[PDB]
Amino acid sequence: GYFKIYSKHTPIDLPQGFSALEPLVDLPIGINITRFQTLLAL
Amino acid sequence: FNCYFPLRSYSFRPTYGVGHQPYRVVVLSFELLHAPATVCGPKKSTNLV
């Protein structure tokens, strides 16, 4: 039921390198999630 | 006839009895679900040594 979101912003195909993702927000949603989709700015 | 408006009006006055004066009643109901509990009481802290 916890929604954990990790994030990492780095100034620069995927680049070859190593970068850990620090935790960003813990969302106590307590729901069921099975599918997702993204949103674009036109 | 045989048909009356179901909601009647309180008539409160500053010259009424203890049982007839308006009383503000708030009922606090608590529920526990599979969702994470988040309504916590104040958490007391002691000074550091």
What is the stated resolution of the deposited model, in angstroms?
A: 3.0
Residue A23 is inside which H or E element, if any? strand A22-28
Euclidean distance between CA atoms B21 and B27, whole angstroms? 19
Euclidean distance between CA atoms A24 and A22, whole angstroms? 6
CB A10 within 8 A of CB A19: yes
**B39: distance to nearest CA of chain A, Å?**
12
Name the DSSP letter for residue A16. S
**A29: distance to nearest CA of chain B, Å?**
7
Euclidean distance between CA atoms B28 and A32, whole angstroms? 29
In chain A, how long is the greatest CA-to-CA distance? 36
With an 8 Å Cβ cutoff, is A1 touching chain B?
yes
DSSP letter for each residue of B1-49: -----S-------TTS-TTTS------------SSPP--PPP-------
**What is the number of alpha carbons within 13 Å of residue A17 lying toward its C-beta?**
9
Phi/psi for A35 (5° steps) reads -135, 160
